[PDB]
Amino acid sequence: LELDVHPVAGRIGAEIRGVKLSPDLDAATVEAIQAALVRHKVIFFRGQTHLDDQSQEGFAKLLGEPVAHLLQLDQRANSWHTDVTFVEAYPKASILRSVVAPASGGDTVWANTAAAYQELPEPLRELADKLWAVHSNEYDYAYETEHPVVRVHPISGERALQLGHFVKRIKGYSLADSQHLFAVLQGHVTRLENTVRWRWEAGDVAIWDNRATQHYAVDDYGTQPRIVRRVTLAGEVPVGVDGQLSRTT
Amino acid sequence: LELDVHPVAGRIGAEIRGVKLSPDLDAATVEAIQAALVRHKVIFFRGQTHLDDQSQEGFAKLLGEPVAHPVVDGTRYLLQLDGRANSWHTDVTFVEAYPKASILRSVVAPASGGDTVWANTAAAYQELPEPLRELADKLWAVHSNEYDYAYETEHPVVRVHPISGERALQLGHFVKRIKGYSLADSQHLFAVLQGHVTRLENTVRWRWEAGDVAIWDNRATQHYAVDDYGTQPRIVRRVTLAGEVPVGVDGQLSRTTRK
Amino acid sequence: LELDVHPVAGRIGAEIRGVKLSPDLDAATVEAIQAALVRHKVIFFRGQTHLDDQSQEGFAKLLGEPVAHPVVDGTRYLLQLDGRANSWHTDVTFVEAYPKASILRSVVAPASGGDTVWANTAAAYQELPEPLRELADKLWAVHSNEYDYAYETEHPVVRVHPISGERALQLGHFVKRIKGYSLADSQHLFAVLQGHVTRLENTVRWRWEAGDVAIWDNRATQHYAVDDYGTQPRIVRRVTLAGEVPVGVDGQLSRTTRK
Amino acid sequence: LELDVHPVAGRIGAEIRGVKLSPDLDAATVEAIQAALVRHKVIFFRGQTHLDDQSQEGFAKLLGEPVAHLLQLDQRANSWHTDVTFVEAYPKASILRSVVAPASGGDTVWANTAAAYQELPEPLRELADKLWAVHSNEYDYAYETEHPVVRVHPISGERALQLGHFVKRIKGYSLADSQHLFAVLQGHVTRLENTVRWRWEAGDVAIWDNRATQHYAVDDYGTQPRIVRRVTLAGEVPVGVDGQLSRTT
Ligand SMILES: [Fe+2]
Ligand SMILES: [Fe+2]
Ligand SMILES: [Fe+2]
Ligand SMILES: [Fe+2]
């Protein structure tokens, strides 16, 4: 199927039109969705007002096995992160529905961590390839794992930075050097060029490849009500450039 | 007059609908647009597909005295940007009285990428803890035209806005250094204050369509042109309006120091 | 009494000669040593090869009330450091009333490396431009005992010294964060102020010989033990003297917040 | 000859006793000096009060060809640098005599740039190996050259960071990334452990391997008089890990 896919930004994000999301889509719509997702890192479906907790949950299961910690968020995820990277097999994907949408503010921003890696000069990609980092849940908006800083993506084979606010430190370097190296690689992920911002409407859905993005939820809506609900899908164990695996410690 | 005003982001930015920009809008509509501008820092008008080089110029004049910098043919003041401003700045802060405002029109608009992001330098200011507001009040910076996408001047880091009375951070990528401080100290003080300006909360991103027009209060924003569109054509045209001499928290004024 | 005092570095540090440290020095010699200490921030006595665990302890008591922290046998208060403090700090700033002073003796001294460097936190303060003195006055930091080489407390960043009246930076590697600021802002404000403390100009390095003794005013220094000697034995023994509760620029006092 | 060599710090610097410096030392004393210099990166000779402008200059020539820009310094070199790295063939060595020595202050500090490199974790040495930097004389205390950040030392073969305040930027990286990477590699050079500080007496001489050190002159002596005089020796063209050479641009 060629679905109706309109890219949102130069280097990540696509709206998909003419698809009402259900627990009843057929393998072709589902696979096309899954390739749009790998290609564009985050995908959006508007006017999905027919959807409700249970359709979301049953629509989710069509794309892998759901995992706990359906989550409700209402306090606010404004730091750049990849969902649950303090566990070994952190989600492969998240599906997020807008239940209550603020009139101004309330946006969400995604960063493509594959392209982030691609744009690093070669010597700085070689070094990213050899680094590992400690993820902890000292930080949660809603455990200590070691992940390689470069995740070879189990399906595209695309390499992506595996970083974000869950990172406690880079293994094997002083405080000062871990901050400097994390600032470099991290500031490549959040470079504006590598991101896409979604202004939400009630009933909008977004689905992202957590193996290959970070995201941040803008806290600018003061006390306007904002409720979003999230389903995540279990993910594989991260494999680094040299084949080594993540290990929870 | 209450224009039909839809805020884009929590802290900056408003679309204005039902207004057809021309050299012939009445004083009232202009005043209301001036109020939206000061309040929202950047305002957007979609579907101005009737505008052209000359009407953009004539429309500009209704909001102040346009000024140049090499301009588009047929025009007195129009600067074309194409073949990129991907760097947080405030326009021409390397001169003493930098534009108070720029009016930008989309001529050619990439199918994907091509966006622009504005930051609310007055909100950046309000959010800093008192002691660091106090320090920002007391600093000065040298701006230069080394780093231009399209001269040295000394500006306070905090500009008292000549109409709102709101204080704003005055920084961006025209800054060579903070006057009075080592290089390491300059970079760390700059990095703190700048990082409030660009904090996502303080920004608004616009996706352009041919005929979109944006107007921003350059006294109280920085902006950034996102360079993600490859070789897709992107043509925008800009008119700037002459601005006043910035006045610091304690009345001091900027001074050009190389020309 | 004018002791025989030779300054080591331009801005901190003095060797004192012709004095044999004992539990039996007269009030005069002690007062003169107290004056050298406050003036020079760290003072050095070579060739105290007669000192031992007990005489070090007895000598300490002549300068204030010694305090502990697991101590050396035979002693009430003596801490042994060996098998390393290579990190700029001020002693035990994770407690509310941290030592005002430590007295350190070299027991075993590497043939090469093994040095120690002190920084004059009061000079670090004097050298900052007025506006950044003003900001440093207004800040507070949390110190913790996460990072120890040998509890959370809140200290002003500027301590008014209880005898000299000199203000000093109160920072070092016991600081977890600046209270009231993001992580990025804390690290940048910390990095600015710290970088004045350790600026080479403000420091003095000592090469140890067995029997060297150093005494520093812990209210107005940081120090650092240089880790360059490999597996060469290094044994030093330290006695700390109880200190007052730090008082900030505007009279506020530190408060322990976890124990 | 085993000369009388007493190391000053754990990882750089040695005083040499029982040697009066002259234009008349014999090849054995001179070679032993040259090996002490390569081994310990900086070497010091006390009580050389017999020395004067011309003996210095004639003692110098016994260790390579002198090069201009005998220099007099009196304003002050307090930034970490390697002498003349804005030229292609910057000095291999400097010889510095203390003419007037302040009573307190006035010290000098050297950093061993070889050991600095040695202590970097492997992946961060691999990346240093591939970097180049632009040296300029926008900064002089007393031209734009590209040097590799890692100089393979023409005699020891020891690799050393080639950095310092003459560096305008790292070639091939944004402003922000060049500052972050330079801070990392640079803060390894100036780590206290890698340095040695000399308190000068009138007539003290110091000679350093500029291929393998940086140094900084402490400005803490206010208006006390301080005069030192320096002779430098021409050096080879820097060769990087991969054999490429520096090029003045
Ligand atoms: Fe999340
Ligand atoms: Fe601009
Ligand atoms: Fe200590
Ligand atoms: Fe030099």
Domain residues of chain A, as ranges?
Answer: 1-249
Most B CBs within 10 Å, among A39, A192, A196, to test the B interface: A192
The β-bridge partners of D217 are: D108
What SS3 string covers chain C? Answer: CCCEEEECCCCCCEEEECCCCCCCCCHHHHHHHHHHHHHHCEEEECCCCCCCHHHHHHHHCCCCCEECCCCCCCCCCCEEECCCCCCCECCCCCCCCCCCEEEEEEEECCCCCCCEEEEEHHHHHHHCCHHHHHHHCCCEEEEECCCCCCCEEEEECEEECCCCCCEEECCCCCEEEECCCCHHHHHHHHHHHHHHHCCHHHEEEECCCCCCEEEEECCCEEEEECCCCCCCCCEEEEEEECCCCCECCCCCECEEEEC
SS3 A54: helix
- Given the structure tokens 């970079």, which residue do they identify? B187
| Fold of the domain spanning D1-249 | Double-stranded beta-helix (3.60.130)
Token pair of A109 as six digits: 């921003």
The H or E element spanning position B186 is: helix B183-197
Amino acid (1-letter code) at residue A192:
L
Q: How far apart are CA D193 and CA D9, in angstroms?
A: 8
The H or E element spanning position B9 is: none
Q: How far apart are CA D202 and CA D218, in angstroms?
A: 17
Q: How far apart are CA B141 and CA B181, in angstroms?
A: 10
Task: Please compute, for residue A199, the number of CA atoms within 13 A of its CA located in the half-sphere on the CB side.
Answer: 15
The β-bridge partners of D6 are: D15
Q: How far apart are CA B177 and CA B152, in angstroms?
A: 11
For residue B224, give the DSSP letter.
Answer: E
SS3 B131: helix
Burial label, D38 (beta-carbon count in 10 A; 0-12, 13-18, 19+): middle
B90, B221 Cβ separation under 8 angstroms: yes
Report the separation in Å between the CA atom of D248 and the middle of ligand 2, taken as the mean of its atom positions.
35
Active-site annotation holds for B6: no
Q: How far apart are CA A249 and CA A143, in angstroms?
A: 7
**Alpha carbon of residue C218 to chain centroid:** 3
**Alpha carbon of residue A219 to chain centroid:** 18
For residue D9, give the DSSP letter.
Answer: S
Token pair of C176 as six digits: 């977890």
Please tell me the experimental approach by which this structure was elucidated: X-ray
SS3 D184: helix
CA atoms C10, C15, C18, C21: torsion sign: positive
Token pair of C226 as six digits: 């240089």
How does DSSP assign D140-181, residue by residue?
A: ----EEEEESEEEPTTT--EEE--STTEEEETTS-HHHHHHH
The H or E element spanning position A216 is: strand A213-217
A123 contacts on D by Cβ (under 8 Å): 126-127, 130-131
Q: How far apart are CA B152 and CA B92, in angstroms?
A: 11
Over the range D2-17, which residues count as b (16 or more CB within 10 Å of their CB) and which as e? Answer: ebeeebbbbbbbbbbe
Task: Note whether B228 contacts A193, CB cutoff 8 Å.
Answer: yes
Pairing of strands C158-160, C235-241: unpaired
Token pair of B21 as six digits: 């920009």
B39, B123 Cβ separation under 8 angstroms: no
Phi, psi (5° rounding) for residue A58? -75, -30
The H or E element spanning position D17 is: strand D14-17
Q: How far apart are CA D219 and CA B147, in angstroms?
A: 34
Furthest C-alpha separation in chain A: 52
- Given the structure tokens 């040298």, which residue do they identify? B142
SS3 A100: strand
**Alpha carbon of residue A85 to chain centroid:** 10
Q: In the CATH scheme, what is the homologous superfamily, with its name and number, of domain B1-259?
A: Clavaminate synthase-like (3.60.130.10)
Burial label, B130 (beta-carbon count in 10 A; 0-12, 13-18, 19+): exposed
Token pair of A233 as six digits: 């899908």
Residue D165 is assigned to a ligand binding site = no
Burial label, B49 (beta-carbon count in 10 A; 0-12, 13-18, 19+): exposed
- Given the structure tokens 């306090």, which residue do they identify? A75
Resolution limit in angstroms? 2.5
Report the separation in Å between the CA atom of C120 and the middle of ligand 2, taken as the mean of its atom positions.
46
What Rg, from alpha-carbon coordinates, does chain B have? 18
Token pair of A209 as six digits: 């490849």
Q: How far apart are CA A25 and CA B151, in angstroms?
A: 63
Token pair of A33 as six digits: 């969705």
Amino acid (1-letter code) at residue C254:
S
Q: How far apart are CA B217 and CA B100, in angstroms?
A: 6
D133 contacts on A by Cβ (under 8 Å): none
Over the range D160-193, which residues count as b (16 or more CB within 10 Å of their CB) and which as e? Answer: bbbbbbbbbbbeebeeebbbbbbbbbbebbbbbb
A119, A86 Cβ separation under 8 angstroms: no
Annotated catalytic residue within B11, B89, B155, B173: B89
- Given the structure tokens 């090849």, which residue do they identify? D27
Task: Note whether C10 contacts D220, CB cutoff 8 Å.
Answer: yes
How does DSSP assign A127-196, residue by residue?
A: HHTT-EEEEESTT----EEEEESEEEPTTT--EEE--STTEEEETTS-HHHHHHHHHHHHHHHT-GGGEE
